[PDB]
Design a protein around this ligand. Sequence first.
Ligand SMILES: Nc1ncnc2c1ncn2[C@@H]1O[C@H](CSCC[C@H](N)C(=O)O)[C@@H](O)[C@H]1O
Ligand SMILES: COC/C=C/c1ccc(O)c(OC)c1
Ligand SMILES: COc1cc(/C=C/CO)ccc1O
Lengths: 354, 360
Amino acid sequence: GLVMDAATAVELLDAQPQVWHHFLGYINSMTLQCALELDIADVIHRHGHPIPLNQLAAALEIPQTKAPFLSRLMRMLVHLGYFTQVITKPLPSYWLAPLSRLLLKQNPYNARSLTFCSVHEHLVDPWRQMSAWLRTGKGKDTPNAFAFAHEGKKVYEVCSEDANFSQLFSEGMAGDSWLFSRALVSKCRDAFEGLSSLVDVGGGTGNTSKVIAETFPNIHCTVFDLGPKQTHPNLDYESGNMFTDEIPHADAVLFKWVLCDWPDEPVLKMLKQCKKALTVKGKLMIADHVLDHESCNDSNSMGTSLILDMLFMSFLEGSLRTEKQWAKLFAEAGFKDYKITPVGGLRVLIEVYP
Amino acid sequence: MDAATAVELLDAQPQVWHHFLGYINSMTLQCALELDIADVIHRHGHPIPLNQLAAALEIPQTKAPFLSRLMRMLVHLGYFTQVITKLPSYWLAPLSRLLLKQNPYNARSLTFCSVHEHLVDPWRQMSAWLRTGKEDGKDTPNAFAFAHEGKKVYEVCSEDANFSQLFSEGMAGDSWLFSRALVSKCRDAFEGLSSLVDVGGGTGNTSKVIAETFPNIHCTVFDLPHVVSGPKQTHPNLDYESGNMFTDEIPHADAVLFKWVLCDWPDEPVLKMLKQCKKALTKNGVKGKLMIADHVLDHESCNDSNSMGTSLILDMLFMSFLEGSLRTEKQWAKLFAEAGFKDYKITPVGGLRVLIEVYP
Ligand SMILES: Nc1ncnc2c1ncn2[C@@H]1O[C@H](CSCC[C@H](N)C(=O)O)[C@@H](O)[C@H]1O
Ligand SMILES: COC/C=C/c1ccc(O)c(OC)c1
Ligand SMILES: COc1cc(/C=C/CO)ccc1O
């Protein structure tokens, strides 16, 4: 259509890049995904020492004519903290920074699958219909934007149609469990002392329970859930629906990154069922986010937590709860006391006593 | 692996999530613009409760809890504030000046342009493009063209007036602010000029401010026909000429200005054009000057970690959809030398950018 003092103009001019940085956030996603697609971290690691740009391009099957673009991509990734670069000719050479441990294929805790899963069309595309879903009232409505953009299908049904996407999700969860469980049994050692049995609800391939069982040789761990499963003498598996099937009895019931996927109604119903079972008393163990906890209250951590809340809002049916929200559920479910112990990775352990 | 190493890696993991979940920032901001949140709150005139805000955005009351969560995200990003009254009430933060429709410097169009399918999608073919040789005939100058059946962006703009309008409006909004900073912080750069050609000057926001601030300077914006045939800034000492800077003669002037233009293009055509400017700027023994309003990637004014992060993000954006980069001082100085220039001066302006005066 048709078509301020200097100090104010400069201030506003200088404020723009903060906005650009926000709306160009997808550039971080896509640059990281490229690094993974190209196996950059692995190729550098295989080299065994800093690798010159030309040799890196060659190993990546990037034409020498495009090495300058590879160089710019590396500069971005160095800034993100994955790699380092130096110029040994008076021609950059690249090596690994500590954050790259999380990209290496050889590490069972690498984040490759979660990355591919997270930036997949399945999870990004629905956001272009988020405004419409938000404005949809109650027969065109769906539980979330994901379903809104997948003809009514929630993520679990889409997982059953898309084996690759499903595999990425599971591998991504398994990778996190590898690291989280090792931090959990160390940071929260006292929470496992005294137990003879634990049920790991949504425990999947048993990565969490394997570590508990190996660390605390007297705990009989049972994974209760809907690749080959981890083996341990004190680790077994039971098939079931946590919402509509009865949870096996044990000294402790564990929910690792599970309750965050669901809204208060089905969570409360399940907790009430857990309170009945756990009562001689056992205890509830929740390894998950307490959004406003002191241990993750710094702005960087809060930013990432809130980003997860948005991610979950779009494709799951849960959220990252505050202590107040958790405490209300515990109270309503009939539990009497809880104790929070920080673990790491934005998450804590909540022990809840019936 | 000992426990301490496991905890350290577990605590480093969220940095990675934050990286790959970057698009959530993009999409939450775009939602805020789609929903007109800033404008609706501003029009309300004072902090607005959650339930009233839902109604004002035509979000059903049953979806208010989701709106609350989106606002919590946007408050953290710094666009809005939550005002404590004892439901949450919401108000505007300083950053929201850049979202309001009534401000001629708002960043709405640039945001929509930037997160558009045209610019996001080619990234899913970046690895394939990087691995493409100039032999099997599938090569293109960048991933954008690779993903657009060989079409480059300024071609897509001449054919797609909507996306094109987003991009030119986006540039205009920045120019509105940048030009006001420029004439203030670099006032001396305009001394003694009687003419200036703003090459790729768009819809004239830059030259309009130059012309008003420096009455002796006749300003000519030189851009493509589809950019300067519509509404644009007007002034008695400002006019527009159309053409292609690579194939047509640039208008003669005491100063040649490139604002956010040289960064779109690779060294070879940039050098050729700078050589042309050096010749033009030294005709008949009299010397003009070259002015570049652009990124100097390693300049002190944008050397901090946050600024550098945004510069490199732009370098990536430009790599995908343009044919240029954010050049370091080393890269610029080499071009100046090869083009035949004899001196330069760099003065910071703002928004990651500087003025380079280049003298023949
Ligand atoms: N071949 C060409 N000849 C002249 N202008 C061109 C061109 N190719 C692209 N452009 C123009 O260069 C500009 C780049 S974006 C910069 C616009 C303006 N200087 C500003 O800073 O706000 C666009 O207006 C685009 O239309
Ligand atoms: C010659 O044009 C320079 C382009 C600058 C630009 C800056 C930020 C953007 O988001 C963006 O997205 C389109 C473009
Ligand atoms: C699909 O991508 C993600 C999923 C989760 C889910 C956690 C608990 O269900 C956490 C982080 C991610 O990036």
